[PDB]
Amino acid sequence: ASSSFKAADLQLEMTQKPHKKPGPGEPLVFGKTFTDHMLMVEWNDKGWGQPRIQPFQNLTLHPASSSLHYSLQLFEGMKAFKGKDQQVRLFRPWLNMDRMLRSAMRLCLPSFDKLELLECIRRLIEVDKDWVPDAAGTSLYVRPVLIGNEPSLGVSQPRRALLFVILCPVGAVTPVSLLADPAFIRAWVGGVGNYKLGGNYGPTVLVQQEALKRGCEQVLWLYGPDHQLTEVGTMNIFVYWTHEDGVLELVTPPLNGVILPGVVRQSLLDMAQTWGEFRVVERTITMKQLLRALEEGRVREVFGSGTACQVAPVHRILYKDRNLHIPTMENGPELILRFQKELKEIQYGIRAHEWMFPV
Amino acid sequence: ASSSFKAADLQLEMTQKPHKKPGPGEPLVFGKTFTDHMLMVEWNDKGWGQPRIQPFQNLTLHPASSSLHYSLQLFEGMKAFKGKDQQVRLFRPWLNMDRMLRSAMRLCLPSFDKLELLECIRRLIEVDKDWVPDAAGTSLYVRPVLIGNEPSLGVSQPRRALLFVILCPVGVTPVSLLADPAFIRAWVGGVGNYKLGGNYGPTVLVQQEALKRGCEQVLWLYGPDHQLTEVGTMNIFVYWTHEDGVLELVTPPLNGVILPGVVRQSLLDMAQTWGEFRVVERTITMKQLLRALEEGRVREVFGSGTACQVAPVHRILYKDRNLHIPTMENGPELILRFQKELKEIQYGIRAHEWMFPV
Ligand SMILES: *Cc1c(COP(=O)(O)O)cnc(C)c1O
Ligand SMILES: *Cc1c(COP(=O)(O)O)cnc(C)c1O
């Protein structure tokens, strides 16, 4: 069933025609430019096949592939950074490997050895090393994907699967406005919003378009009768404020089933707790608490965290037909800038850290 | 172009390699046998391309296709029946087209003319007409799909899409259900009321959990009061004598967690035209079912859907207790009546406006 593929059995097929690299100064739009190679591993009832780094090419899928009919698909997202010394380093990839496996088990997709996938990805990034940019605010986005590939129309356990990894060079704090409407629910307790599955994203496109029509940039996902702040778009939410007791704290919603356990989220919690300058807690945040904190002048900063945008400040929330100004930007944004500075130092290798995996 | 593809612009490529084809062939397993041809239509920001009936072949997709990363995918399911006179007819396909368009709009996928897609599908079934079986209880399952095919990694409205249709020749038996409140299929404010791929993938593990606990399918419960919503991928109906003493047929309302089934609607239409009992759409709770079973007021409980048509329920495993549902010892009179009437309409024994000739 699952004996896993090995990096030692990795086959390499180099490209005959290397693609046109963007070049210095050229704008790198998110997920539009792809590298020369990709990783590919196939699975069936007998087990996993040999992993291979092959040229970037199209996938050949049967029209009845369960990935297209029943969303037997999941993905991951992590970044690789290149420092001044030309050394490429991956940001906490072990955590993405842990999350990917959990997503695989939830969709009855094959298990794999996390360290073997990590080594195969390390080798893929090494082959396409020249594609990783070295300018400030730039990186390489790594996109691992595991899909069901059963050539049948029954809603069941796939007897075939495909694991592939693609790479994208991405370029270079901008404040965002949010729509907070209780009618749109992203995830439910006992659901699958805590897993990075394709199914959680497609239905959010219309909600984002609805945010744009009301003058907002992103969506503030509310949950329950008390209107709990859960996520901001595809990012985890943090609030830096003076709490009701009078203590300065950094709060983010707890992992109770409706929150995707973000790697950047975990990193910000680790970093803030190591400093020991304020209280760091995982607690439910309601719109009433936020509103009362805003009118009492207790809110300092509100922001989103995730791989793509890193740390994204919030300046406005549209809730119950009222525009609420969030004092982020006016408060520095001190905490955001400190988090960004320390993350940039770790990521680009200015400061050595166990969080970075060298390629 | 401009708004929709036209069936008048239909291109036809016949197969140079026709495959297998069953006897009969004895076990006609659902979705494992495919026909010789498929319909394919592409879309981009400039409009729809020319529709094409081509041989059954693999799809060629870019690794960054939005259908594989963000589940910008939807599907439909309807059946084509071959009668005595060898005439093939589709069951209320207009309703499936209406639902497919609603699903498309929910995922910001391109709009299309419903009657033009129906005509393109009619032409596809005509090309593969010999694949439709004529035996009792058999049919041709039609599977339309619309996917996002944007070669980018941003979660946004696709600038490219693909619409394809594949066909499957397919062939009263009671079922057992697992009723555990821990499993949630859909939520109010969600997308369980649309036939999107995303609603099915997470159910695979739950179905495996039903099988290892001794049941054949899942009874989907919702809320603190344990509302019976769906039976697997079928709508649920309860035929009973209500607390007020009135004989009624009830099915959960379209409040966001129920998929508006074509068979569901057809059973509601038929039962309403008979006028022999009350026919309503209302929430059904496990407490109400238990109370009715104890008082001997339940006659029949069943699921409705395209694949299994009408499926009787005999057992529900709830709170680690096996609850016997008396469906089979009450005939099942209503199920058999629905099945008889559906068969007469489907196989062309009686002419009806619900059937679309191919
Ligand atoms: C990807 C994602 C995040 C952030 O996770 P990171 O691992 O930090 O990139 C947060 N919320 C949702 C809904 C996400 O999809
Ligand atoms: C397809 C489906 C139904 C039934 O719809 P029909 O149009 O009658 O085939 C019911 N519930 C779910 C969840 C479904 O996917």
Could you tell me if B19 lies within 8 Å of chain A, comparing CB atoms? Answer: no
Candidates B147, B145, B133; CA nearest to B76 is: B145
Determine, for residues B190 and A198 on separate chains, whether the beta-carbon distance falls below 8 Å: no
Cis peptide leading into B24, omega within 30 of 0?
yes
Phi, psi angles (nearest 5°) of residue A270: -65, -45
Closest among A200, A197, A196 to A187, alpha carbons compared: A200
Chain B's closest residue to A212, CA to CA, is B156
From its phi and psi, is residue A77 left (phi > 0), alpha (psi between -120 and 50) or beta? beta
DSSP state for residue A110 in the 8-state scheme: P
The rounded radius of gyration (Å) of the Cα atoms in chain A is 21
Orientation angle between helical segments B93-106 and B262-274, nearest 10 degrees = 130
A155 reaches B (C-beta below 8 A): yes
Name the amino acid, one letter, at B236. I
Residues A191 and A51 in one domain: no
Looking at residue A35, its amino acid is T
Crossing angle between the packed helical segments B262-274 and B333-346, to the nearest 10 degrees: 110
Burial of B182 (0-12, 13-18, 19+ CB in 10 A): exposed
Residues of chain A neighbouring B156 (CB-CB closer than 8 A): 205, 208
Q: Do B61 and A62 touch (CB under 8 A)?
A: no
Residue A7, judged by CB atoms within 10 A of its CB (0-12, 13-18, 19+), counts as middle
Query: A177 and A163, same structural domain?
Result: no
CATH number of the domain to which A263 belongs: 3.20.10.10
A343 DSSP 8-state letter: H
d(CA B346, CA B83): 8
A228 close contact with B: CB closer than 8 A: no
Task: Look at strands A37-44 and A52-55 and give their pairing.
Answer: antiparallel
Residues B201 and B158 in one domain: no
> Do B221 and B328 belong together in one domain?
yes
The angle subtended at Cα B333 by Cα B331 and Cα B335, nearest 5°, is 110
Residues 6+ apart with CB under 8 A from B161: B42, B43, B44, B109, B110, B146, B147, B148, B149
Contact B60 A56 (CB under 8 A): no
Tell me which residue of A357, A334, A347, A349 sits closest to A275, measured CA to CA: A334
Backbone region of residue B210 per phi and psi (left: phi > 0; alpha: psi in -120 to 50; beta: other values): alpha
CB within 6 Å of ligand 2 — which residues? B 77, 195, 230, 233-235, 259, 261-264, 304-306
Nearest CB to B155; choose among A34, A65, A201: A201
Q: For residue B261, how far is its CA from the centre of ligand 2 (angstroms)?
A: 5
Cβ of residue A326 lying under 6 Å from some atom of ligand 1: no
Flag whether residue A258 sits within 8 Å of chain B, measured between CB atoms.
no
The 8-class DSSP code of residue A286 comes to B
Q: What is the length of chain A?
A: 359
B198 touches chain A (CB under 8 A): yes
**Residue B154 belongs to a domain with what CATH number?**
3.30.470.10
**B171 contacts B43 by C-beta, under 8 angstroms:** no
Per DSSP, what are the bridge partners of residue B302?
B237, B312
Name the residue with tokens 């397919």: B170
**Cβ-based neighbour number of residue B9 at 10 Å:** 15
C-alpha distances out from residue A309 to A337, B266, B321, Å: 14, 49, 51
- Are B334 and B354 in a shared domain? no
Query: How far is the C-alpha of B5 from the C-alpha of B335, rounded, in Å?
Result: 40
d(CA A211, CA B155) in angstroms, rounded, equals 14
Structure tokens at B18: 């026709």
Query: Touching check for B182 and chain A: CB below 8 Å?
Result: yes
Q: Tally the domains of chain B.
A: 2
What three-state secondary structure class fits A270? helix
Spatial CB neighbours of B50, under 8 Å, sequence gap ≥ 6 = B5, B9, B10, B11, B41
Q: Is B141 annotated as a binding residue?
A: yes
Residue A231 Cβ inside 6 Å of ligand 1? The answer reads yes
Q: Are residues A166 and A180 in the same domain?
A: no
CA–CA gap between residue B165 and residue B186 (Å, rounded): 27
The reply to whether A311 and A352 lie within a common domain is: no
**Are the beta carbons of A35 and A56 closer than 8 angstroms?**
yes
For residue B232, give the nearest of B318, B304, B181, B132 by alpha carbon.
B304
Query: DSSP letters along B248-308, please?
Result: EEEE---SSSS---HHHHHHHHHHHHH-SSEEEE---BHHHHHHHHHTT-EEEEEEEETTT
Closest CA to A307 of A118, A78, A23, A61: A78
Report CB contact under 8 Å: B63, A164.
yes
> Is the same domain home to B146 and B295?
no
Shared-domain flag, residues A250 and A152: no
- Whether B30 has its CB under 8 Å from any CB of chain A: the answer is yes
- DSSP, residue by residue, A119-164: HHHHHHHHHTGGGS--STT-EEEEEEEEEE--BS-SSS--SEEEEE
Residue B49 contacts residue B120 (beta carbons within 8 Å): no
Ligand nearest to the CA of B186: 2
Handedness of CA A28, A31, A34, A37 (dihedral sign): positive
Residue B180 sits in the same domain as residue B327: yes
Q: Which residues of A touch B72 (CB under 8 A)?
A: 202, 205
- Interval between CA B173 and ligand 1 midpoint (Å): 45
Residue B343 tokens, joined: 């068969």
* B177: nearest Cα among B227, B213, B224: B213
Q: What is the CA radius of gyration of chain B?
A: 21
Helix (H) or strand (E) holding A336: helix A334-347
Cβ contact A109:A144 at 8 Å: no
Rounded to a whole number, what is the distance in Å from the CA of B34 to chain A's nearest CA? 9
Cβ-contact B313, B231 below 8 angstroms: yes
Sign, Cα dihedral of B241, B242, B248, B250: negative
Q: In a 3-state reduction of DSSP, which class is residue B14?
A: coil
DSSP annotation of B166 reads: E
Entry field: residues in chain B: 358
- Which secondary-structure segment (H or E) carries B343? helix B333-346
Domain that holds residue A96: 1-172+345-359
Among A114, A109, A35, smallest CA distance to B64 is for: A35
Q: Where are the alpha helices (DSSP H) in A157-230?
A: 205-213
Q: Which residues pair with A338 in a beta bridge?
A: none
User: Kind of pairing, strands B37-44 and B47-48?
Assistant: antiparallel
The one-letter amino acid code at A231 reads E
Tokens 């699975």 locate to A43
Residues A211 and A205: beta-carbon distance below 8 Å: no
Q: Distance between CA A183 and CA A319 in Å, rounded?
A: 12
Name the strand (E) or helix (H) holding A106: helix A93-106
Cβ within 8 Å, pair A154-B196:
no
A230 lines ligand 1 (CB under 6 A): no
| Chain B residues within an 8 Å CB radius of A106 | 202, 205
DSSP states of A235-269 as a string?
Answer: EEEEEEEE-TTS-EEEEE---SSSS---HHHHHHH
Site to probe by mutation for ligand 1, drawn from A145, A196, A255 as the one with most ligand atoms within 8 Å of Cβ, is: A196
CB contact under 8 A, A58 and B62: yes
CA distance B73 to chain A (A): 6
Residue among B58, B64, B70 whose CB faces A198 most closely: B70
CB A194 within 8 A of CB A230: no
Measured from the Cα of A236, ligand 1's closest atom is: 10
Helices (H) and strands (E) in chain A, counts: 7, 20
Could you tell me which residues come within 8 angstroms of residue B71 by beta carbon, excluding any fewer than 6 positions away? A71, A73, A197, A198, A199, A200, A201, A202, B196, B197, B198
C-beta atoms of A206 and B107 within 8 A: yes
Cβ of A225 under 8 Å from any chain B Cβ? no
A287 shares its domain with A301: yes
What distance in Å separates the CA atoms of residue A298 and residue A240, rounded to the nearest whole number?
9
> For tokens 């020991």, what's the residue?
A276
Cα A276–Cα A247–Cα A238 angle in degrees, nearest 5: 70
* A/B interface, count of CB pairs below 8 Å: 191
Q: What is the resolution of this structure in A?
A: 2.0
Alpha-carbon span A135 to A275, nearest angstrom: 29
CA A172 to chain centre: 17
User: Among candidates B338, B263, B269, B331, which has minimal Cα distance to B299?
Assistant: B331
Strands A310-319 vs B11-12: parallel, antiparallel or unpaired:
unpaired
Instruction: Please check whether residues B299 and B354 belong to one and the same domain.
Output: no
Atom of ligand 2 nearest to the CA of B232: 13
Beta strands in chain B (DSSP E): 11-12, 37-44, 47-48, 52-55, 59-61, 73-75, 78-82, 88-91, 139-148, 160-170, 175-179, 217-222, 227-231, 234-241, 247-251, 278-281, 298-305, 309-318, 321-324, 355-357
Q: What is the number of H-type helices and E-type strands within chain B?
A: 7, 20
Phi first, then psi, for residue A54 (nearest 5°) are -125, 165
